[PDB]
Design a protein around this motif. Structure first.
Motif, short mmCIF file in Angstrom:
data_model
loop_
_atom_site.label_atom_id
_atom_site.label_comp_id
_atom_site.label_asym_id
_atom_site.label_seq_id
_atom_site.Cartn_x
_atom_site.Cartn_y
_atom_site.Cartn_z
N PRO A 119 0.80 -1.23 0.00
CA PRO A 119 0.00 0.00 0.00
C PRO A 119 0.83 1.27 0.00
N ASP A 120 2.14 1.19 0.26
CA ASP A 120 2.97 2.38 0.23
C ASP A 120 3.23 2.86 -1.19
N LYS A 121 3.27 1.94 -2.16
CA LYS A 121 3.57 2.28 -3.54
C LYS A 121 2.42 2.06 -4.50
N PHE A 122 1.40 1.30 -4.12
CA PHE A 122 0.35 0.92 -5.05
C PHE A 122 -1.02 1.08 -4.41
N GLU A 123 -1.97 1.57 -5.20
CA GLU A 123 -3.38 1.66 -4.82
C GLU A 123 -4.16 0.80 -5.79
N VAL A 124 -4.73 -0.30 -5.30
CA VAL A 124 -5.32 -1.33 -6.15
C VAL A 124 -6.79 -1.03 -6.37
N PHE A 125 -7.21 -1.05 -7.64
CA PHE A 125 -8.60 -0.93 -8.03
C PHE A 125 -9.02 -2.21 -8.73
N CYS A 126 -10.12 -2.81 -8.29
CA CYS A 126 -10.67 -4.01 -8.90
C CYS A 126 -12.00 -3.66 -9.55
N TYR A 127 -12.10 -3.89 -10.86
CA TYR A 127 -13.29 -3.56 -11.64
C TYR A 127 -13.97 -4.87 -12.06
N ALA A 128 -15.05 -5.21 -11.37
CA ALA A 128 -15.81 -6.41 -11.69
C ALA A 128 -16.73 -6.13 -12.87
N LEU A 129 -16.67 -7.00 -13.88
CA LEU A 129 -17.62 -6.97 -14.98
C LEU A 129 -18.80 -7.90 -14.75
N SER A 130 -18.87 -8.53 -13.59
CA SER A 130 -19.90 -9.48 -13.22
C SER A 130 -20.48 -9.12 -11.86
N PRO A 131 -21.75 -9.41 -11.62
CA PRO A 131 -22.35 -9.14 -10.31
C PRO A 131 -21.80 -10.10 -9.25
N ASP A 132 -22.11 -9.78 -8.00
CA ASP A 132 -21.67 -10.60 -6.87
C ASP A 132 -22.38 -11.95 -6.91
N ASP A 133 -21.61 -13.03 -6.94
CA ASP A 133 -22.17 -14.38 -6.95
C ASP A 133 -22.28 -14.99 -5.55
N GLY A 134 -21.93 -14.24 -4.51
CA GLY A 134 -22.11 -14.68 -3.14
C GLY A 134 -21.01 -15.56 -2.58
N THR A 135 -19.94 -15.79 -3.33
CA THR A 135 -18.87 -16.66 -2.87
C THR A 135 -17.81 -15.87 -2.12
N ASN A 136 -17.00 -16.59 -1.34
CA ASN A 136 -15.94 -15.95 -0.58
C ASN A 136 -14.86 -15.38 -1.49
N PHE A 137 -14.65 -15.97 -2.66
CA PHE A 137 -13.70 -15.40 -3.61
C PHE A 137 -14.04 -13.94 -3.89
N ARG A 138 -15.29 -13.68 -4.28
CA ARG A 138 -15.74 -12.30 -4.45
C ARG A 138 -15.59 -11.52 -3.15
N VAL A 139 -16.01 -12.12 -2.03
CA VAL A 139 -15.91 -11.45 -0.74
C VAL A 139 -14.47 -11.02 -0.47
N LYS A 140 -13.52 -11.93 -0.71
CA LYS A 140 -12.12 -11.64 -0.41
C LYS A 140 -11.61 -10.46 -1.23
N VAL A 141 -11.84 -10.48 -2.54
CA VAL A 141 -11.31 -9.43 -3.40
C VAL A 141 -11.95 -8.09 -3.07
#
Ligand SMILES: COc1ccccc1[C@@H](NS(=O)(=O)c1cc2ccc(=O)[nH]c2cc1Cl)C(=O)N(CC(=O)O)Cc1cccs1
Lengths: 10, 697
Positions: free
Chosen positions: B261-283
């Motif tokens: 986080p000192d050098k990078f600010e991460v943006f995640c752009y989902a092209l899909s809705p939330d499917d309710g799984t922990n994978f989505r939850v984690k990201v």
């Protein structure tokens, strides 16, 4: 996602 | 005047074939001025409106066409294509079935109908409808190439060579006439096309995005030229329709949270809705910002948000796969855009500046295969979250039922505690492998598997049947959670021989070709006490593979098929195999990571395409250069040696077992630091203003 074919009517 | 409108409608059809869609739209509308009730112009116009992404306006004209002529077969078929692109599959079927009702010999409609059956998993029906279309219109590039892929999916190698000839002949003619090729870029890796044809195929599918963004009339974006607005942090955007229960998340779900986080600010752009799984939850939780672009269907607005977040590096993780919205990249909202992980090949497109690969996967001599510039990772570009998802597989124990290491296997988080409760646990120094004798405890576990019981308890520990993980904890079965019980995996669960070498390949069947099966047959004939383990995907391919194995002299019991299993069971049951035989045509990239994590050696023969060289890249990073074959004869020799030299097999199995941990292959923490160094090279290069150049170094 398989593509489809459009028909050109003459 | 229907006569003049007819001239304009035919002229528009000609301009439409030449790719001049804007003029075709202008001519169709002019025909509708001269003849408002021109049902043919309404339909033809709606087709080109669909090509430009204006689906709602296309439907309006399709219905206007069918109000005029209720029996307009062409309109129903074309409208069906617009409804299918709109994800309304029931509406597309009703349109397709209505069209074939009006015109029983409507070749296009049968082919379009066949596409639904294909996407549905009804391959036999898709084949039947594609063959009907070709029977009515033998010159049908779309129906032939999609039929060719159906046959590839089920491993129907009927007139394969001639089929390949005609495929290459169709693409060359389409590329010569500047028509969109009927072979998908993702599928091109499977056919004997030239590297020029593959990139050209990609290049023209990348240009389709422009047709959908040109009607947006958006001006180019102004990009940041320093990191002052982001407090000296590089803003990286990860775009993917696969933030959820998808192989891609199973590979890189830890990377966002592991960014510095000192050098990078991460943006995640989902092209899909939330499917309710922990994978989505984690990201969503570990990323600095999570933007659900599925809520923003318009690429113009969606592209604006990306640019308005100040993204410096935009990462394309879909390529030409389902859920991709590459139009966002065609608008270039970020100064640097790179392909990474998701797609095994070149975009062939202009907007993609880099493709993140490595020296093994994409050696410099094949730079001509890619439109982008090569950006090399230190070891391998591939990565998997196996260390985080399946830690219970870091250690194992076996049951000496007579010492094999893959006949009866115990995995678990509390494995050592359970082993410490037993008085007669032996160790075999390799990390060493503990062995449980054939005592009362051993018979109890075996009894559970034979009797098909779900689980038992021994010394207070729960011992789970590997085949019943879903009935115990569905989260554990999908890899969302780590199984909290000690799991038992036995060759007997899958009908594998207890006293024979097991060559496995859990790749999808379409990656196998006649040459590949012939290699495997040669290996089985040379190793008599061995069998081939394959995945039923699709199940209708099982009889197809058998027949060819039968022609090559292998009895039907030498090839054992298992159904598709949950993620955890798929990765865990890889421990039962002795060797993994990789598919040369297209390597199993995710499958290779699963097999390697299980400590199973994988034999591979790297080809020339990127998809055919990933397996070799993974092993090179793992440190097992002896499993990479330079030709087919060395591929077979390497496999035969692992099945007949049990001392050499033990050595190579222990090598993979140790180096999966000691090598960088599964070290996501190290992979992220190396990826960050590569990101900064790209930005430093951009800071000077230099155009995207090769990062091979
Ligand atoms: C490109 O992959 C895609 C693309 C889009 C959607 C999903 C997958 C894929 N995901 S995966 O790679 O993480 C996986 C592989 C196997 C293989 C053998 C087995 O016994 N169980 C498995 C379970 C899993 Cl979750 C998948 O679930 N499937 C199963 C299905 O759709 O029924 C397809 C396969 C991929 C590779 C071998 S089979």
């Amino acid at each position: 996602e398989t593509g489809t074919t459009n028909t050109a009517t003459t | 005047c229907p006569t003049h409108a007819d001239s304009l409608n035919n002229l528009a059809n000609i301009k439409r074939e030449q790719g001049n869609i804007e003029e075709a739209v202008r001519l169709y509308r002019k025909a509708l001025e001269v003849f408002p009730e021109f049902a043919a112009a309404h339909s033809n116009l709606a087709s080109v409106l669909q090509q430009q992404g204006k689906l709602q306006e296309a439907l309006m004209h399709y219905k206007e066409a069918i109000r005029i002529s209720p029996t307009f077969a062409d309109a129903y078929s074309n409208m069906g294509n617009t409804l299918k692109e709109m994800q309304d599959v029931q509406g597309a079927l009703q349109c397709y079935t209505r069209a074939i009702q009006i015109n029983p010999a409507f070749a296009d409609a049968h082919s379009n109908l066949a596409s639904i059956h294909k996407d549905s998993g009804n391959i036999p029906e898709a084949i039947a409808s594609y063959r009907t279309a070709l029977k009515l219109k033998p010159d049908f590039p779309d129906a032939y190439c999609n039929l060719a892929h159906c046959l590839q999916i089920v491993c129907d190698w009927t007139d394969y060579d001639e089929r390949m000839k005609k495929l290459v002949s169709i693409v060359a003619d389409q590329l010569e006439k500047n028509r969109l090729p009927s072979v998908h870029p993702h599928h091109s890796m499977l056919y004997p096309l030239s590297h020029g044809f593959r990139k050209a195929i990609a290049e023209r599918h990348g240009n389709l995005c422009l047709d959908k963004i040109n009607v947006l009339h958006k001006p180019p974006y102004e990009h940041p030229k320093d990191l002052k607005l982001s407090d000296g942090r590089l803003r990286v955007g990860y775009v993917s329709s696969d933030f959820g229960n998808h192989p891609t998340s199973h590979l890189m779900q830890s990377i966002p949270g592991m960014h510095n986080p000192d050098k990078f600010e991460v943006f995640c752009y989902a092209l899909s809705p939330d499917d309710g799984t922990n994978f989505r939850v984690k990201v969503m939780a570990e990323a600095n910002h999570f933007i659900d672009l599925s809520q923003i269907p318009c690429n113009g607005k969606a592209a604006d948000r990306i640019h308005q977040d100040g993204i410096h590096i935009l990462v394309n993780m879909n390529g030409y796969t389902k859920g991709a919205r590459n139009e966002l990249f065609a608008l270039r909202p970020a100064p640097i855009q790179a392909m990474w992980l998701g797609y095994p090949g070149t975009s062939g497109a202009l907007f993609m500046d880099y493709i993140i690969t490595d020296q093994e996967t994409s050696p410099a001599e094949v730079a001509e295969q890619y439109s982008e510039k090569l950006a090399y990772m230190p070891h391998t570009f591939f990565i998997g979250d196996h260390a985080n998802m399946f830690p219970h597989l870091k250690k194992k124990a076996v049951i000496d039922f007579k010492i094999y290491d893959n006949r009866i296997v115990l995995n678990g988080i509390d494995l050592k505690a359970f082993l410490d409760s037993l008085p007669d646990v032996k160790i075999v120094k390799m990390l060493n492998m503990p062995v449980i004798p054939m005592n009362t405890i051993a018979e109890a576990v075996i009894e559970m598997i034979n009797r098909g019981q779900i689980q038992i308890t021994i010394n207070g520990f729960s011992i789970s049947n590997g085949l019943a993980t879903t009935q115990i904890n569905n989260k554990a079965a999908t890899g969302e959670e780590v199984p909290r019980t000690i799991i038992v995996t036995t060759r007997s669960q899958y009908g594998l021989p207890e006293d024979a070498i097991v060559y496995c390949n859990f790749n999808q069947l379409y990656k196998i070709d006649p040459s590949t099966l012939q290699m495997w047959a040669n290996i089985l004939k040379r190793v008599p006490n061995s069998v081939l383990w394959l995945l039923r995907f699709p199940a209708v391919g099982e009889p197809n593979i058998q027949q060819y194995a039968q022609n090559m002299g292998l009895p039907q019991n030498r090839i054992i098929f298992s159904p598709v299993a949950p993620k955890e069971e798929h990765v865990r049951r890889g421990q039962l195999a002795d060797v993994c035989l990789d598919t040369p045509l297209c390597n199993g990239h995710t499958t290779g990571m699963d097999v390697l994590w299980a400590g199973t050696p994988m034999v591979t023969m790297p080809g020339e395409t990127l998809a055919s060289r990933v397996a070799a890249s993974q092993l090179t990073c793992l440190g097992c250069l002896e499993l990479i074959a330079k030709n087919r004869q060395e591929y077979e020799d390497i496999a035969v040696k692992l099945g007949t030299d049990l001392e050499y097999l033990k050595k190579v199995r222990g090598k993979v077992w140790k180096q999966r941990i000691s090598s960088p292959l599964f070290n996501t923490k190290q992979y992220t630091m190396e990826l960050e160094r590569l990101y900064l090279q790209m930005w430093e290069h951009y800071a000077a203003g230099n155009k995207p150049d090769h990062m091979i170094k």
